[PDB]
Amino acid sequence: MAVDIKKIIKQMTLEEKAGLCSGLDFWHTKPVERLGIPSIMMTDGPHGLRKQREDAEIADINNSVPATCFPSAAGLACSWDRELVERVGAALGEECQAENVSILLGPGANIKRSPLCGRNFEYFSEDPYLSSELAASHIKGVQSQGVGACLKHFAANNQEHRRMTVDTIVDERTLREIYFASFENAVKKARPWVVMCAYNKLNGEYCSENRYLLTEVLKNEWMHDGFVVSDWGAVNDRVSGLDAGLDLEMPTSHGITDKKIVEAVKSGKLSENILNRAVERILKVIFMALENKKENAQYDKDAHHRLARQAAAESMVLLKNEDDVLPLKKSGTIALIGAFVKKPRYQGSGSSHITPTRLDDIYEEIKKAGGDKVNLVYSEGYRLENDGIDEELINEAKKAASSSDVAVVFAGLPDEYESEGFDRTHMSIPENQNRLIEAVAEVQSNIVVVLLNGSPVEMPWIDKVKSVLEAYLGGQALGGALADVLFGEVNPSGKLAETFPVKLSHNPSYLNFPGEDDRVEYKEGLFVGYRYYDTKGIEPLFPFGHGLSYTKFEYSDISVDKKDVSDNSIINVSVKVKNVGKMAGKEIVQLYVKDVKSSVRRPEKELKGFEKVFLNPGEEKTVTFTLDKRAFAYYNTQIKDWHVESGEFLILIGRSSRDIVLKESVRVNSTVKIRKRFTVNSAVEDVMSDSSAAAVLGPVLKEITDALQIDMDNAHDMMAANIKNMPLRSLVGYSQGRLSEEMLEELVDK
């Protein structure tokens, strides 16, 4: 096919090639009817299709063709289930084929640096391994149906405030280990047809014209074979952008930037090979979509609704379950309290907003699962229409809670709190909802709180409640999934993909979010998410990877393939997980790697593997993990490559980042050695660390150290520490030759 692609570009005029690198309208590429090049359509989004209708204004974001609204990424990621996410991706692909969409503008895979980021609900995790794995699964599913996925937003689009002008200042190592890392394996393992650049600047340059970002990292290093699309209106200098690696500008600019491409080529400022390479990347995707186009495609809207119900039920997180209040008994009286019972929160706002084909009713689904023997009572409790206080609602809700055997309060973040375009300003539930939970907990000790929200929230009442069910934004089948888990038809198996801090101010980005004067600096560096709380010793409300189950899982017999391993070697880790309870369920096994000693500062531990296993009561199965070099390597900026510092590494396997149950030690070694360059201002102790250089300076230093009667093995003496901190030039001040020192420095480097 590629031989035919080159033949088509030879037949295209310069104006036709430059027009292809820009959109036709808001969602379509320009056709070339002369050569049979068709026009393809791309649209949102990550957790559901949002195709705008024909007779709709461009700003009418929600006026779209009905499609399945799946759980958003923030909740779906809590499944830790690569298979479940791929199936949701395949369902999205099926719906694209049915609606003649060639490219889905998803998934979103930006790192959750701050809990306040407005789009956290449609992102996966604060961890680059969990994010990349689930993003790769999402892409594989979408593209298994013959349509393209668009990974976004590349990169470091971690706040909505000033996202179109802010200069994001991130050091290289933090990028390689955290923000680039979230996208890296999604590109490498899933090979998405398109990657979308971000609105923001990264270290002085907009991502749409950042050649290091788009060409050096994405296209050359990671070998991205598809094309790169801009975010909508993210193009600044089109010619600079095309040379940097931005292939397709969206939306259309009505030929303004197209004429700039043609004039720059004819002027000689822009090589035509740059244009041909971008056209070739775009045409490859266009014809790959045409090749996989399914005529008269249909999907089963009811089957996708049941999938959305399963996806939500298997990603809900049981944060707390004191006295095993959940699952609810199918008897007695159950009280449902909250405005979210009738008007539930199930998705976010912005370009990802979905017009659902259906929407489950929470009260009816629970009543259906409860049965005849259950008496179901509802009380409004609080009102979303007014952020005020209404003691009549609180008093009526307390009376309903007292008469019942159990009270279930549905609370969380209203629709206005979370959206694309702006961030949250605080991390707390509306006060009228907090007053209700505390009031219900006073009169009914058996109180369950169901949280509907796209991002972490503070829970000041956490000690007054028995059960907290975190459903995130569960999609259009939230009601059924809630009924399934609350009554135990589904054993909850979701575990958090991001840290829930006690206070917003605890979070690592707090002092540097959202920045000042079109500038934000990631001064926390690597220490994002649980990496911060673990290393700082700060206890979150609920840690990364936390999630309970109606059953208990016992870990035992941790195995390792090897104990002494090299950089180019591979270790195999094994653990046996047994369901020691009475109810079947799925357990998310988590593997972390700890570097006990390293010259560079690294987090306490980093997630490097996760699997989900289903276990019947009493059943035991073995779970396996493979450990790459990348499981032990940090990014070394000097050699511009991943490096493993020789030392001991702990393989931590547990039920959460703070529930490690088994550990094993391994020793990983490297043949790579970093060469340090010394000067006349280099510390004496640093030069004596290189045995080659120590042979040159050791004897000379011995003459001065004994003449000064200084002990150098006394690690608690000032003069010993002065000799260690001394620059080499100060040694000549005792007894040497200035020129002789320069020769010794040359020999040390040689």
Next chain:
Amino acid sequence: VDIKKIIKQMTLEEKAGLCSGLDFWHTKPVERLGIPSIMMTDGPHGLRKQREDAEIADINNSVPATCFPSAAGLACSWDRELVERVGAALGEECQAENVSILLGPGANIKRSPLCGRNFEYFSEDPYLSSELAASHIKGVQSQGVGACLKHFAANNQEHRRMTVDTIVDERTLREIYFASFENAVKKARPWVVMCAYNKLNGEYCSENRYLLTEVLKNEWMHDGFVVSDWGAVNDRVSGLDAGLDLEMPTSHGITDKKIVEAVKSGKLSENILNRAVERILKVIFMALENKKENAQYDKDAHHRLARQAAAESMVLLKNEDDVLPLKKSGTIALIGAFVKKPRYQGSGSSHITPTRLDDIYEEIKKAGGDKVNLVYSEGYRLENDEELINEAKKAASSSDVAVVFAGLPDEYESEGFDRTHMSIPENQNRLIEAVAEVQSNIVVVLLNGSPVEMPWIDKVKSVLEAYLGGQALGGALADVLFGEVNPSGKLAETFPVKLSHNPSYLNFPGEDDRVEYKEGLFVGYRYYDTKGIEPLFPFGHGLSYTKFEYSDISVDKKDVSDNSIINVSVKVKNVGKMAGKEIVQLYVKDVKSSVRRPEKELKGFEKVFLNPGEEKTVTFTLDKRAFAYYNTQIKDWHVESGEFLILIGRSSRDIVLKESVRVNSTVKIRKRFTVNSAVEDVMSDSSAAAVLGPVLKEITDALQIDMDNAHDMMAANIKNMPLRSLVGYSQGRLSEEMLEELVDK
């Protein structure tokens, strides 16, 4: 006028020789012109003059002098008068030993609890540090000798202190690290300032012209000279041009030969050299005029002062069930190796050979009297054992109260290296836990120069923090333990629960000759307050044997300008039965500001003595600097118009009274807009908004977008949108260039 006439008579070799030392402690004399040689020596909390018949490397073999409490403990007095008196006692001892310049005080900010020299620094707060440093300098120089402020600047770690590149943003320097030295220079005018060993943003402090000339000599108007740290000079000519006047110690003419060669070559102007010589000579002859021949000081009175300084700066961190003060009856058990070998000073160039030394056991027995049965048990050994623990448990159970003396051994804290952890030795922790099991009434006295973790804090009733109390520590401990002195010390630095909590933890001591202060302003309590992290004991915390009730907070004005001044008043009443001193603390909070600044910052403190039932009024004056942050754009202190809270309390976390104030400025910063400026930012300038409003109004209505909906995506897209994107939302590029011209004009 006579100084300039002397410089005309000096040869070029003599001018270059004066800018470098004669030996380790003396300047070069010029006998031809009557220029004498003056001596400088350590240190901040006591005189350490090396003896004549002493080896050159024998750091501790010095003339006996009074060892006062080090700065870390002395700062907990919060008493400018007490610190100045200690400075004056230091000056008298310099005069007695013919020392013209004391190499003190040290005033570097406590960024990390692990810094090795924290024991001889004042505080983590630049206001408390600058005020007490100014008091120390005033005291020393009231006696006719010079003080040497050190170390300038940002010398906040001992690891690689001679090669590390310290990376600090401008605003953090101006508000925290420079600020610790600023008012000490301005209010006390020390004769000498010492540069630090480290690099500050790429340049050694010894040749950092922005540091020594632009900030210290030009902006702050330092009229004395600048001396290098010992061996901190790199390129002598560069340093002389940068503002480094005196290189110490001597280099035996090596750098002197570089200065003469650089002047004769024409690379270095002689006016630069003459200006440095004039700064050195001005101080030399100012010392000669104030030289007191054959001066003697009262060694006993300075010992009592060192006892008073320690007793008034010990911090009662905890006192559950009022175990302290101890009763003068029953049986009291003193446990710990620190009973016989107490920790009372640090290690390094500031180490003092004391003229006297109180014995903890004898002073306590003396203060206890006939009715007290005093029993001793060793408990633990510093040299390395359950026998010591078992004997100590029987002694604690047999007693009515047990007092354990614990802390950091001498090897832990010194100049030259930092601490690696923040806990007292484990054999001491095991002992405290064992004694707390069998004796519930347990008092822990801590001897240490820097914060320590206290995992046993819930097992003990009283914790008395004595820091490094000096040569009269034993008497001062007896004074406070039995209530002869009502303790009034309050922490000058935050005591974290865990080392990892502290702001510098992820960036200390750095890597590869580089450390970056990525926490910025948020050092000390500024970090814990804004982050909501609970310290073990907060900044400004300290208990008393009596209680003080605050009331009637008054304020001079409620609406004030940038150039105005506010006067704050508060009434403090001793509502207890015992007289005592209370440290009143004033903080300023900026409730809303465009720049990120801490939750609150200390801007005033006073200490008042109150007899039982007595009430006195405490007054504060609030400068422009009390509300201003450092604005890097205008390179000046700036006050954003808004509301400010005046917080008065007994500690940084015990605010008792508050008052609201509104501070305004007529100074307005002009922002320059481009085609890449956000629409919302351009609408912030009412002049420029008048240019863009109409054009933006057409686009907003054509798209049916509500712009008063602060929770809508499309409204937020218009706000974040660059002006160039407006053409994409329908406009003309050429009209946009004209609109940008009108906005800037």
